Each structure stands twice: as structure tokens, then as C-alpha cells.
Amino acid sequence: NDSTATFIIDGMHCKSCVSNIESTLSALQYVSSIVVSLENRSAIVVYNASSVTPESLRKAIEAVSPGLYRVSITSEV
């Protein structure tokens, strides 16, 4: 019954920015888990809340390379 969301970044330093994002996100006092799309520029992040609120994780990705990171919530819609 955990939460989950997906985020994609334009402007990241590729496969090393990718792993800063694993570390920066998997430290959050509300997150349960995470996997980053190693090939690509995105992350699938697993948190916990009934009030589905993906904006906090988007902000945590932006906070790994702020001013550079174009973080976008790529959900199925």
C-alpha cells in the first residue's frame, strides 16, 4: 500500500548524476525505495502516503543539481 511516482530530468550529468539521485532520494524521511533508469534520464521512486503527493520527490531531485535539473513527473496519463 506504498506510494510510487516517476520523474525524468533534462540537463543531468548522465550515468553519474543518475547515481547521486539514487543517494539523494533514498535518504528522504518519507521514502520507502527507488530505482533509477540507468540507460535513460529518469527515476521510479517509491514513498509512503495515502495523500499521493509526488511534488516532494520532484523537489528532492531538483535539489541534487538545482538550477540545472528540468525534473518532470512522467506518469501514465
Curated annotation (Swiss-Prot):
Disease: Menkes disease: An X-linked recessive disorder of copper metabolism characterized by generalized copper deficiency. MNKD results in progressive neurodegeneration and connective-tissue disturbances: focal cerebral and cerebellar degeneration, early growth retardation, peculiar hair, hypopigmentation, cutis laxa, vascular complications and death in early childhood. The clinical features result from the dysfunction of several copper-dependent enzymes. A mild form of the disease has been described, in which cerebellar ataxia and moderate developmental delay predominate. Occipital horn syndrome: An X-linked recessive disorder of copper metabolism. Common features are unusual facial appearance, skeletal abnormalities, chronic diarrhea and genitourinary defects. The skeletal abnormalities include occipital horns, short, broad clavicles, deformed radii, ulnae and humeri, narrowing of the rib cage, undercalcified long bones with thin cortical walls and coxa valga.
Modified residues (Phosphoserine): 65
Cysteine disulfide links: none
General function of this protein: ATP-driven copper (Cu(+)) ion pump that plays an important role in intracellular copper ion homeostasis. Within a catalytic cycle, acquires Cu(+) ion from donor protein on the cytoplasmic side of the membrane and delivers it to acceptor protein on the lumenal side. The transfer of Cu(+) ion across the membrane is coupled to ATP hydrolysis and is associated with a transient phosphorylation that shifts the pump conformation from inward-facing to outward-facing state.
Entry's localization field: Golgi apparatus, trans-Golgi network membrane; Cell membrane; Melanosome membrane; Early endosome membrane
Residues with the Phosphothreonine modification: 53
Segments forming domain HMA: 3-69
Tissue expr: Widely expressed including in heart, brain, lung, muscle, kidney, pancreas, and to a lesser extent placenta. Expressed in fibroblasts, aortic smooth muscle cells, aortic endothelial cells and umbilical vein endothelial cells (at protein level).
Domain observations: The nucleotide-binding domain consists of a twisted six-stranded antiparallel beta-sheet flanked by two pairs of alpha-helices, forming a hydrophobic pocket that interacts with the adenine ring of ATP.
Name by which UniProt lists this protein: Copper-transporting ATPase 1
Binding site for Cu(+) 3: 14, 17
Subunit structure: Monomer. Interacts with PDZD11. Interacts with ATOX1 and COMMD1. Interacts with TYRP1. Directly interacts with SOD3; this interaction is copper-dependent and is required for SOD3 activity.
Record family assignment: Belongs to the cation transport ATPase (P-type) (TC 3.A.3) family. Type IB subfamily.
